[PDB]
Design an enzyme around this catalytic site. Structure first.
Site, PDB file in Angstrom:
ATOM      1  N   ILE A  10     -52.673 -54.606 -82.035  1.00 35.08           N
ATOM      2  CA  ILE A  10     -53.533 -53.441 -81.914  1.00 35.08           C
ATOM      3  C   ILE A  10     -52.837 -52.218 -82.445  1.00 35.08           C
ATOM      4  O   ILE A  10     -53.475 -51.328 -82.997  1.00 35.08           O
ATOM      5  CB  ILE A  10     -53.860 -53.150 -80.449  1.00 35.08           C
ATOM      6  CG1 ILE A  10     -54.975 -54.037 -79.948  1.00 35.08           C
ATOM      7  CG2 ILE A  10     -54.281 -51.707 -80.304  1.00 35.08           C
ATOM      8  CD1 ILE A  10     -55.371 -53.719 -78.558  1.00 35.08           C
ATOM      9  N   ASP A 120     -48.628 -37.629 -70.777  1.00 40.04           N
ATOM     10  CA  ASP A 120     -48.667 -37.830 -72.224  1.00 40.04           C
ATOM     11  C   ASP A 120     -50.019 -38.089 -72.879  1.00 40.04           C
ATOM     12  O   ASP A 120     -50.109 -38.883 -73.817  1.00 40.04           O
ATOM     13  CB  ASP A 120     -47.817 -39.014 -72.609  1.00 40.04           C
ATOM     14  CG  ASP A 120     -47.669 -39.113 -74.093  1.00 40.04           C
ATOM     15  OD1 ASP A 120     -47.665 -38.035 -74.744  1.00 40.04           O
ATOM     16  OD2 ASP A 120     -47.575 -40.198 -74.707  1.00 40.04           O
TER      17      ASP A 120
HETATM   18  N1  LIG Z   1     -59.072 -51.487 -77.687  1.00 39.01           N
HETATM   19  C1  LIG Z   1     -58.035 -51.106 -76.886  1.00 39.01           C
HETATM   20  C2  LIG Z   1     -58.173 -51.392 -75.538  1.00 39.01           C
HETATM   21  C3  LIG Z   1     -57.209 -51.058 -74.643  1.00 39.01           C
HETATM   22  N2  LIG Z   1     -56.998 -51.177 -73.342  1.00 39.01           N
HETATM   23  C4  LIG Z   1     -55.802 -50.628 -73.044  1.00 39.01           C
HETATM   24  N3  LIG Z   1     -55.223 -50.158 -74.143  1.00 39.01           N
HETATM   25  C5  LIG Z   1     -56.044 -50.403 -75.151  1.00 39.01           C
HETATM   26  C6  LIG Z   1     -55.928 -50.091 -76.588  1.00 39.01           C
HETATM   27  O1  LIG Z   1     -54.802 -49.431 -77.048  1.00 39.01           O
HETATM   28  C7  LIG Z   1     -54.801 -48.949 -78.393  1.00 39.01           C
HETATM   29  C8  LIG Z   1     -53.675 -47.946 -78.564  1.00 39.01           C
HETATM   30  C9  LIG Z   1     -54.008 -47.032 -79.738  1.00 39.01           C
HETATM   31  C10 LIG Z   1     -52.816 -46.437 -80.501  1.00 39.01           C
HETATM   32  C11 LIG Z   1     -51.634 -47.384 -80.681  1.00 39.01           C
HETATM   33  C12 LIG Z   1     -51.999 -48.775 -80.198  1.00 39.01           C
HETATM   34  C13 LIG Z   1     -52.377 -48.722 -78.730  1.00 39.01           C
HETATM   35  N4  LIG Z   1     -56.943 -50.476 -77.398  1.00 39.01           N
END
Ligand SMILES: Nc1cc2[nH]cnc2c(OCC2CCCCC2)n1
Length: 283
Positions: A10, A120
């Site tokens: 992600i 943050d």
């Molecule tokens: N779809 C999604 C669901 C989540 N549920 C908890 N954290 C999440 C996340 O983090 C993305 C975040 C964005 C910037 C760098 C990567 C992490 N993305």
């Protein structure tokens, strides 16, 4: 861990890598954070599990195995940064901006009433869904994991060396995020701590004892700071109406004790006509 199948990277975050993953028995799709283990952290994180609210991203489970730590969270399909980029041409309709702000303030109010803070906030940990809800992710973590002090959204008391800063530091951040939504440009894009401060000072004026009693006594305050005048908010978030700038202005009070709380902000007149629109998302 073996109980999870990684689907995709992600992105890389504060505490490590975040993966999209599936639970090989529940079939549930989740977000998995590998935290980069002290007993204190395990205990604090275990408390944050009980913190449940519609505008807080749910911490589903805590997995402590082989010296390692993994956080399992409810998954959403888009962060607010992606959304704003996707909206850079046209901007987000005010009514949606207002819905998001209101939902985020409910989240903050909830956590703060329990003395939990984020420390943050940034568009990247604001997550949205197809139904028009927005939720805060990573609440309470910094304090657990004992994360030391993107500077763009940092409150001025943190930048001046206050070690015992409060829930107000989250209000500052949300205010910065609010402005960015309205204008489609970051409010204080610092590229060093001093640049961050000075950009703040160039817009809101250099703080002094008149506006912020005690400020000249903060550990990193220098009498040698340049002294700039304050600019009108009409020029800082232009299209924004008067109730909006009024609320924004109270979110960006220098004095942490005079900065509006989340609960009082929910009562601001800017929210008199609040609705819950649905966004147009391409997942
Ligand atoms: N779809 C999604 C669901 C989540 N549920 C908890 N954290 C999440 C996340 O983090 C993305 C975040 C964005 C910037 C760098 C990567 C992490 N993305």
């Amino acid at each position: 861990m073996e109980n999870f199948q990684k689907v995709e990277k992600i992105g890389e975050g504060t505490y490590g890598v975040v993966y999209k993953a599936r639970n090989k028995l529940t079939g549930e799709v989740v977000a998995l954070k590998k935290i980069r283990v002290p007993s204190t952290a395990i205990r604090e994180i275990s408390l944050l599990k009980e913190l449940n609210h519609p505008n807080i991203v749910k911490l589903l489970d805590v997995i402590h195995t082989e010296n390692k730590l993994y956080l399992v969270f409810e998954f959403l399909h888009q962060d607010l940064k992606k959304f704003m980029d996707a909206s850079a041409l046209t901007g987000i309709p005010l009514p949606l901006i207002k819905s998001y702000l209101f939902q985020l303030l409910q989240g903050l109010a909830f956590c703060h009433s329990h003395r939990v803070l984020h420390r943050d906030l940034k568009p990247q940990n604001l997550l949205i869904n197809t139904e028009g809800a927005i939720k805060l992710a990573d609440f309470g973590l910094a304090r657990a994991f004992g994360v030391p002090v993107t500077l763009w959204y940092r409150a001025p008391e943190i930048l001046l060396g206050c070690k015992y800063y409060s829930t107000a530091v989250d209000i500052w951040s949300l205010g910065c995020i609010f402005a960015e939504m309205v204008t489609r440009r970051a409010l204080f894009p610092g590229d060093s701590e001093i640049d961050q401060l000075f950009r703040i000072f160039r817009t809101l004026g250099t703080p002094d004892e008149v506006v912020w009693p005690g400020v000249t006594s903060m550990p990193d305050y220098k009498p040698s700071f340049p002294k700039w005048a304050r600019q009108d908010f009409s020029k800082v978030v232009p299209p924004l109406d008067e109730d909006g700038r009024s609320l924004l202005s109270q979110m960006l009070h220098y004095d942490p004790n005079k900065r509006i709380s989340a609960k009082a902000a929910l009562a601001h007149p800017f929210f008199q006509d609040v609705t819950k629109p649905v966004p147009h998302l391409r997942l």
